[PDB]
Write an enzyme that holds these catalytic residues in place. Structure first.
Site, PDB file in Angstrom:
ATOM      1  N   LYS A  36      34.244  42.653  36.515  1.00  0.00           N
ATOM      2  CA  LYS A  36      33.360  41.872  35.699  1.00  0.00           C
ATOM      3  C   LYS A  36      32.209  42.620  35.077  1.00  0.00           C
ATOM      4  CE  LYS A  36      34.903  39.497  39.565  1.00  0.00           C
ATOM      5  NZ  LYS A  36      34.806  40.027  40.944  1.00  0.00           N
TER       6      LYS A  36
ATOM      7  N   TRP B 284      33.998  32.615  48.858  1.00  0.00           N
ATOM      8  CA  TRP B 284      35.112  32.779  47.882  1.00  0.00           C
ATOM      9  C   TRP B 284      36.431  32.402  48.593  1.00  0.00           C
ATOM     10  CZ3 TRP B 284      38.103  37.783  46.656  1.00  0.00           C
ATOM     11  CH2 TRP B 284      38.797  37.661  45.456  1.00  0.00           C
TER      12      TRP B 284
ATOM     13  N   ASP C 147      30.620  42.555  50.131  1.00  0.00           N
ATOM     14  CA  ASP C 147      31.546  42.333  49.061  1.00  0.00           C
ATOM     15  C   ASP C 147      30.672  42.275  47.818  1.00  0.00           C
ATOM     16  OD1 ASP C 147      33.652  41.484  47.294  1.00  0.00           O
ATOM     17  OD2 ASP C 147      33.413  39.408  48.051  1.00  0.00           O
TER      18      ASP C 147
HETATM   19  C1  LIG Z   1      33.244  37.353  45.842  1.00  0.00           C
HETATM   20  C2  LIG Z   1      34.322  38.030  45.026  1.00  0.00           C
HETATM   21  N1  LIG Z   1      34.895  39.094  45.613  1.00  0.00           N
HETATM   22  C3  LIG Z   1      35.876  39.829  45.139  1.00  0.00           C
HETATM   23  C4  LIG Z   1      36.357  39.518  43.916  1.00  0.00           C
HETATM   24  C5  LIG Z   1      37.517  40.460  43.500  1.00  0.00           C
HETATM   25  O1  LIG Z   1      38.052  40.357  42.207  1.00  0.00           O
HETATM   26  P1  LIG Z   1      38.913  41.508  41.560  1.00  0.00           P
HETATM   27  O2  LIG Z   1      40.088  41.844  42.541  1.00  0.00           O
HETATM   28  O3  LIG Z   1      39.523  41.063  40.311  1.00  0.00           O
HETATM   29  O4  LIG Z   1      37.995  42.646  41.286  1.00  0.00           O
HETATM   30  C6  LIG Z   1      35.794  38.391  43.134  1.00  0.00           C
HETATM   31  C7  LIG Z   1      36.294  37.850  41.839  1.00  0.00           C
HETATM   32  N2  LIG Z   1      36.272  36.526  41.694  1.00  0.00           N
HETATM   33  C8  LIG Z   1      36.750  35.715  40.494  1.00  0.00           C
HETATM   34  C9  LIG Z   1      35.877  35.897  39.229  1.00  0.00           C
HETATM   35  C10 LIG Z   1      38.212  36.096  40.173  1.00  0.00           C
HETATM   36  C11 LIG Z   1      39.149  35.932  41.348  1.00  0.00           C
HETATM   37  O5  LIG Z   1      39.233  34.811  41.915  1.00  0.00           O
HETATM   38  O6  LIG Z   1      39.887  36.916  41.733  1.00  0.00           O
HETATM   39  C12 LIG Z   1      36.676  34.229  40.729  1.00  0.00           C
HETATM   40  O7  LIG Z   1      37.160  33.463  39.891  1.00  0.00           O
HETATM   41  O8  LIG Z   1      36.082  33.745  41.711  1.00  0.00           O
HETATM   42  C13 LIG Z   1      34.818  37.693  43.746  1.00  0.00           C
HETATM   43  O9  LIG Z   1      34.253  36.629  43.159  1.00  0.00           O
END
Ligand SMILES: Cc1ncc(COP(=O)(O)O)c(CN[C@@](C)(CC(=O)O)C(=O)O)c1O
Ligand SMILES: Cc1ncc(COP(=O)(O)O)c(CN[C@@](C)(CC(=O)O)C(=O)O)c1O
Lengths: 401, 401
Positions: free
Chosen positions: A250, A133, A214
């Site tokens: 989510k 990510w 995570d």
């Molecule tokens: C691996 C991972 N960790 C942590 C989070 C933490 O998100 P939050 O703070 O809102 O709970 C996301 C969310 N990922 C999303 C769906 C949104 C984002 O980028 O924040 C994504 O588009 O990859 C994630 O994909």
């Protein structure tokens, strides 16, 4: 010359900035396939039924808005550890853990790192999969930790590069930090198999590293929350004291409300009490205490036999739906005449699909089809509707024809 | 030996920890006057009427819970800025400012501390008043800044030591940072009188200090919002490009919801755009985006005419009530036969009383009366009820006899 003259313009977020760019497009046929935000079959945000119900009780109980404890809502917190760990867990049963409420996943991950930079005497390195990510990098660097990497995906094969991962991991210096995606890895859509997990746990345990989990998608890999915490639990049961971050943005659709947590597995409950005090000392100067609305809701749902029931059935519903999207996609692909193999679409799990498309292709999508995605080839399969899948398949096909 | 064996037990928070200790007292007569939270006359929490109404609108509007931009809810962010700066404000009409939604005053404050640590290339020093709210230290320190101090209150006289302040102030190295409480100086309750304020501005402008204003009590010092921001606005009118944190926790009682902001006053709107760019990048790997309930509420109120009416009025009544408690408290002390001069109680403004009590008295108050308050002698007058001011009087006296 004033105070901020020397301040540059930085660029928009890789993920979040896509929503922005989307928001400004005038085409009626736009598609926001950037951020992992779940859509219903109508292409609309979906607010769980158990969440709507949950609010109503909050409303009806005429609740105050007094300040939570530094650590959060005790009922949310406890229920969170329990959702992650399981009720029959030793971990949990002996309460050798510490749960701290946090600003969703990110807020948790950060707090965790902050905790890590303070206390983790052993190393400053954090190893992350290749890839991972976007956000994990900054979070950790800004926390004042080093970043490293371990192999993970094979773009050639569109699968896990376990040989590679194993090499890497096996060579990670003792007592280092290693980030592991509990389930439905972002952005790949591929997780190790139960057997491979068992293996990692061996190595990790053997080399004596730090396992930071995570878990932003419990229930979204398999549609089962249990199944989903399998690896995290095994590790624990193997004796490895992990740390972990959980987001309900989510699985419970509480995106905006920010409900999450950070957990630390300790030897003893005493140890826990101690680690807790530190984490409070750490949060206070960060934001004092956490947001109460989402915690209440979650708290309510996890802890009420009838909402927790309703919840799970709704979670399964969204995965099922994502599933039906991959399928139909692949199909519309063939019907458009796509020469290529789009098997990875149905084989990947989660919200996304890591399709392999190149940049001009992404470009092309945006520009001609007003189809929004990240520049990495990653779409958000959950944001697709029965009503738009043919179009996307079309567009994917043309820019690829 | 494990991972966390070296993690020591940390002390409880000097403010928030009190609330903990109270929670564990069984005396049917306990009084928590530690943290600044308003209670009604029955000694109960108060959810602003206006807030219950906004609530019910969000509800009947059937809104989503999708992620909010990294900088927040635009409409809340705009209103905040307008509230603070005034609607006729050049800085505001021209758009030379950048407000971003934060996690209450504390978060707001931290983001600005983080930004400063990042982009304030002229100084590392932060000048705080003697004394100042306890959390300021750590926020500044955890962010990588150095703390300094300036004279403010003279306990011998129970008033502003304008003399020493000017002295100190006047010697502060140029381009340093100066923290100034906008109004209702916590924990003192003694604010500069307009004229003094005029004189501070000059010295601030002359030595070219960056002024960071802490604005957590708008409408609690006079019952007037506009009159409350006089200072702030004056600073800016003399062309002093401040930085500022704002909270709606008290003023709207959204304590738990976490609703505030951080504003940077730029040279122009372009500058402003740049600065923001940087803010988001700074906030993204902290918590990603902020929590939406508080902001929906403050926004709906700040922007819906009737609600504003209502809100302001409720702010008057709260300020009024505080005043009556002070007045009643002083009298009770005489009715009980207090010899000491309690003038200060009434002289002070805001949510507290900085009564002068020493450590042992505070002890007795806790121990025998189960009267909770910070060890600095700070009692929260907002937390006294018609029904207990008597008792309090009684207790303060016996410990003081
Ligand atoms: C691996 C991972 N960790 C942590 C989070 C933490 O998100 P939050 O703070 O809102 O709970 C996301 C969310 N990922 C999303 C769906 C949104 C984002 O980028 O924040 C994504 O588009 O990859 C994630 O994909
Ligand atoms: C000067 C000052 N600034 C900022 C804040 C932050 O409040 P917020 O983070 O919720 O928005 C407070 C709160 N002061 C309280 C009411 C609470 C506290 O100690 O945090 C007090 O008891 O003094 C404050 O007194």
């Amino acid at each position: 010359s004033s105070w901020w003259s020397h301040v540059e313009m930085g660029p928009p977020d890789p993920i979040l900035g896509v929503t922005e760019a989307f928001k400004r497009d005038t085409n009626s046929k736009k598609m926001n396939l950037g951020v992992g935000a779940y859509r219903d079959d109508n292409g609309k945000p979906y607010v769980l039924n158990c969440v709507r119900k949950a609010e109503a009780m909050i409303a009806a109980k005429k609740m105050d808005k007094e300040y939570l404890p530094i650590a959060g809502l005790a009922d949310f917190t406890r229920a969170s550890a329990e959702l992650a760990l399981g009720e029959n867990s030793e971990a949990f049963k002996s309460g050798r853990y510490v749960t701290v409420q946090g600003i969703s996943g990110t807020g948790s991950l950060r707090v965790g790192a902050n905790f890590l930079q303070r206390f983790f005497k052993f190393s400053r390195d954090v190893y992350l999969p290749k890839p991972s990510w976007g956000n994990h990098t900054p979070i950790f660097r800004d926390a004042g930790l080093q970043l490293q990497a371990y192999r993970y995906y094979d773009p050639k094969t569109c699968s896990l590069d376990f040989t590679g991962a194993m090499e890497d991991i096996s060579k990670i210096p003792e007592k280092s930090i290693i980030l592991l995606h509990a389930c439905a890895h972002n952005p790949t859509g591929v997780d190790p198999r139960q057997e491979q997990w068992k293996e990692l746990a061996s190595v990790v345990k053997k080399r004596n590293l730090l396992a930071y989990f995570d878990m932003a998608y419990q229930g979204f890999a398999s549609g089962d929350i249990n199944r989903d915490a399998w690896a995290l639990r095994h590790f624990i049961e193997q004796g490895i004291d992990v740390v972990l971050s959980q987001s309900y943005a989510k699985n419970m659709g509480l995106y905006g409300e920010r409900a999450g947590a950070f957990t630390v597995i300790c030897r003893d409950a005493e140890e826990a009490k101690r680690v807790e005090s530190q984490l409070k000392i750490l949060i206070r100067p960060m934001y004092s205490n956490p947001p109460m609305n989402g915690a209440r809701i979650a708290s309510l749902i996890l802890n009420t036999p009838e909402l927790r029931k309703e919840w799970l059935v709704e979670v399964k519903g969204m995965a099922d739906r994502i599933i039906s999207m991959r399928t139909q996609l692949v199909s519309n692909l063939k019907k458009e005449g796509s020469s290529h193999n789009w098997q990875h679409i149905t084989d990947q799990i989660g919200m996304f699909c890591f399709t392999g498309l190149k940049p001009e292709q992404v470009e092309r999508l945006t520009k001609e089809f007003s189809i929004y995605m990240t520049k990495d080839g990653r779409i958000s399969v959950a944001g697709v509707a029965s009503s738009n899948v043919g179009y996307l398949a079309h567009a994917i096909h043309q820019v690829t024809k």
